[PDB]
Amino acid sequence: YRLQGFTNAGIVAYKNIQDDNIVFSPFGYSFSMFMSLLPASGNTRIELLKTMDLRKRDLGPAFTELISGLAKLKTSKYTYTDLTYQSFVDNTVSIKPSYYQQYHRFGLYRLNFRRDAVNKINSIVERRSGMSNVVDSNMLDNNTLWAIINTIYFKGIWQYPFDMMNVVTKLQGNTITIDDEEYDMVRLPYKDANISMYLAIGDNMTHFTDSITAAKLDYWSFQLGNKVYNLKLPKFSIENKRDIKSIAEMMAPSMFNPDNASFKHMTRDPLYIYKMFQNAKIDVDEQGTVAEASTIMVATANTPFVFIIRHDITGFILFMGKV
Amino acid sequence: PFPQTSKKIGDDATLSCNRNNTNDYVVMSAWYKEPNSIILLAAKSDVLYFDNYTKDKISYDSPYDDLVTTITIKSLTARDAGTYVCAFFMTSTTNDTDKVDYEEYSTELIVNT
C-alpha cells in the first residue's frame, strides 16, 4: 500500500558515505533488504517489520504496489528501465517441498558451492540483465551456503537537445535557501517520459548531502520555475565501489548472527549471512544519460556540482552522486 | 483434470481459471508457462511484462473482474501452443495470520490446421 520508507532506506545508506567519488544506487540496496522478508521468520520477521513501519497485517499487499511501480517505469522505448532478481540455494540445504513450487520460477536455483561456484553465479547474471562481472574471485570461502543478487539498468534521453558546454534554452530555474545557503538548482527533463536529471552547484557539500531525502527533494523539484536560463555542463564519467556491512547491524543484526538467525520457512537447519558489497556506475554523453548498478549480499569478497536522477510522480529515487 | 479449451488458427485463445474460497483476498495473479517462463505477470489493472512480451500478443481482458483471471492471446502461434500455468497467490485477511496458498489449475490449448 505504501513504498514510502523503502526509498529512504537506500537514501540513508548513501548518507553514511564519507568520500568524494559517489555513484550510489539507493534503489538497488533497498530492494534486496525489503524483499528478504520472505525466508525471515520468528524473531527476524518482527525486527524488519519494525524497521519500515510495516504492520504485520500489511505484508502481502506491499508486493502489489511494488509490481505496479516496476511496470510503470516502462512506458516508452527511447527511455525505459529494467530490474531482475536471482538467489542461490545449495543442494545440501533441506528445502521444504512447499517452497519448491510456491516460488520455483522466481529463483532459488540449486547448485553446489564447492565446484566452480564463482562460475555458477556468473552464468545466471548476464541472462537476467545486462550486468557484466558483478562477482569477484575472493567472494567465497569454506562456510558459504547461501547467496542473493540484485540488478538495475537505466537509459534516458534529454528533452531539449544540447546546443563545459553552454546551452541557451528556455527552462525552469530558481534559487534555493536550505539554511543560510545558496544553490541554483536546475532541472533538466527527459523526453517522452516523466523522469529527469537534476543539477546543483555550491561550496559546502556536507550541508547539501546530509539532508538529501525523497521527501525534501520534491520540495526542491517544484520551487524551480520556468524562465530563460543559460547553463554549462561537461562530459565525464564517475565510478564507485564500497561496502555496506558496517551500516547494517542497526537494522537487521540477527541475519548475520548464526545464533539469532530465525530463518525457519525456507529451511529448518540453521543458516546465516556474513557481508555484502556494491558496485555502481554512471556514464554521461551528449544525446542523453546512461546509468547502471548492481548489488551482492554474500559471505566475503572546490565548487563541484551534484547530479540526481528522479522519477516525477512515483518517487523511486534512482542513482544519485556527485561529480 | 480441467477440460482442455481448444480454439482454432489465430483466434481468441480465451483461457480461464477459478478459485474455491471467496472470502480469501487475492494478493497477486500471474500467468506462467510450464516449467519456468512467466509469460506475463499482472495485478489489478496494471500488467508487468516479462522479457519479450507487450500488448500486441497478450492483453488482460478481465481487469474489472476479480473472480476469475482470463487471457485473450491474439494471432495464435505454435510457440504459444503449450502448457499454461495459472496462478492465484492467496492470503487471508480476516485477522493477523501467517499463511500462503498457491492454487494452480494448469490448462492446455492445442492449435492445428
Partner: protein, 172 residues
C-alpha cells in the same frame, strides 16, 4: 477555506445506455463476453437474472456500472434443433415464441449446434443430415457420437429420412 465547484460534466453515451431495448444485442453474445450496459441497479436485478439464467451479473465500475457475463450457453433441444431459424426463443406462459415479450424467460441456442451434435439423439426419435460434412469442429466428444449415428443410420436404412440419406450419400 477555499471552495471550488466541479466543471460541467459531459454525459457520454455510456450513461444514457439502457438495459431495455437491448434484447436484440444482449442475446447475440458468446461465452465470457462482457456486453457493456448502463448503470444497472438492484431494481431490475431479479427479473433480469430470471430472464437470463445464463448470465452471472458482475460489478464493473463505480455507481453500479455492470454488465451481464454469459458463463453457460445451452440449447434446449425441444425447440432449437427442430425450428432451425430460432437462435433465441422465449418462454411466455409455457409457450415458445419468436418476438420478445415481457416476463418471458430468454433462452438462446448453442452456436452452430449442428456442428456439435447435441440434438442428434433427439432428432433420431434434409435439415440435420446435411450437417454431416460440416462437422469440422474436430471435438473428441462430437466425433464419437457422429460415427455412432452414422453406423446406426447405415444399418437401420439397410434393413423418407433413409430415402433422402441415399441421395445425400454421393460425396458427403
Amino acid at each position: 477555506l477555499p471552495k471550488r465547484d466541479p466543471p460541467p460534466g459531459v454525459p457520454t453515451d455510456e450513461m444514457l445506455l439502457n438495459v431495455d431495448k437491448m434484447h436484440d444485442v444482449i442475446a447475440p453474445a458468446k461465452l465470457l463476453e462482457y456486453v457493456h450496459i448502463g448503470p444497472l441497479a438492484k431494481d431490475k436485478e431479479d427479473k433480469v437474472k430470471k430472464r437470463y439464467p445464463e448470465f452471472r451479473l458482475v460489478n464493473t465500475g463505480p455507481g453500479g456500472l455492470s454488465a451481464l457475463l454469459r458463463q453457460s450457453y445451452a440449447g434446449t433441444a425441444p425447440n432449437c434443433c427442430r425450428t432451425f431459424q430460432r437462435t433465441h426463443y422465449w418462454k411466455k406462459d409455457g409457450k415458445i415464441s419468436d418476438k420478445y415479450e415481457e416476463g418471458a424467460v430468454l433462452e438462446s441456442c448453442w452456436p452452430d449446434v449442428h456442428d456439435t451434435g447435441k440434438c442428434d439423439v433427439d432428432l433420431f426419435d434434409h435439415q440435420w443430415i446435411g450437417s454431416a460434412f460440416n462437422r469440422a469442429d474436430r471435438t473428441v466428444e462430437g466425433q464419437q457420437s457422429l460415427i455412432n449415428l452414422y453406423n446406426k443410420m447405415q444399418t437401420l436404412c439397410s434393413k423418407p429420412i433413409c430415402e433422402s440419406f441415399l441421395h445425400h450419400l454421393r460425396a458427403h
